[PDB]
């Protein structure tokens, strides 16, 4: 790719291991563990009106 | 009747009674707050 666009945090993996999707996630199905796979969405205090 | 207190420390009896009463009072005060709904109604009146 000529250029790179930074993805949203919710679409970004916390784990930077290359083979984590086929060695662990393909055999792991715990709900909370699945939740901790990606970063959470973020905003600002001004956008929340606070 | 008093012979039941023989051979024991008055301080441990008072400490155990205080622990009993404190725990029971906390449990029953929470129970009563739920039953009466007192802080909720007064707070809603003041935080209108």
């Amino acid at each position: 790719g000529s250029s790179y666009t930074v993805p949203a945090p919710e679409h970004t993996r916390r784990m930077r291991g290359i083979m984590i999707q086929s060695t662990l996630w393909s055999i792991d199905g715990k709900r909370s563990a699945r939740e901790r796979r990606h970063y959470r969405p973020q905003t600002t205090g001004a956008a929340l009106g606070q | 009747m008093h012979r039941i207190w023989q051979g024991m420390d008055p301080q441990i009896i008072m400490s155990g009674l205080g622990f009993f009463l404190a725990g029971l009072a906390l449990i029953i005060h929470m129970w009563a707050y739920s039953i009466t709904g007192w802080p909720k109604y007064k707070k809603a009146q003041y935080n209108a």
Binding site: - | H2, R3, W5, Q6, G7, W38
Partner: protein, 41 residues
């Protein structure tokens, strides 16, 4: 021998029954006032 020999054990019983009684009365008054404020039955 140990703690609260017979004489002060009797005296301890006296104070302990006095305290239990006083606690019971003050709690009875508290329940009375609560019942006139918001009866629970």
């Amino acid at each position: 021998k140990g703690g609260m020999t017979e004489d002060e054990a009797r005296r301890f019983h006296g104070y302990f029954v006095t305290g239990t009684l006083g606690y019971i009365i003050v709690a009875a008054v508290a329940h009375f006032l609560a019942w006139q404020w918001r009866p629970w039955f």
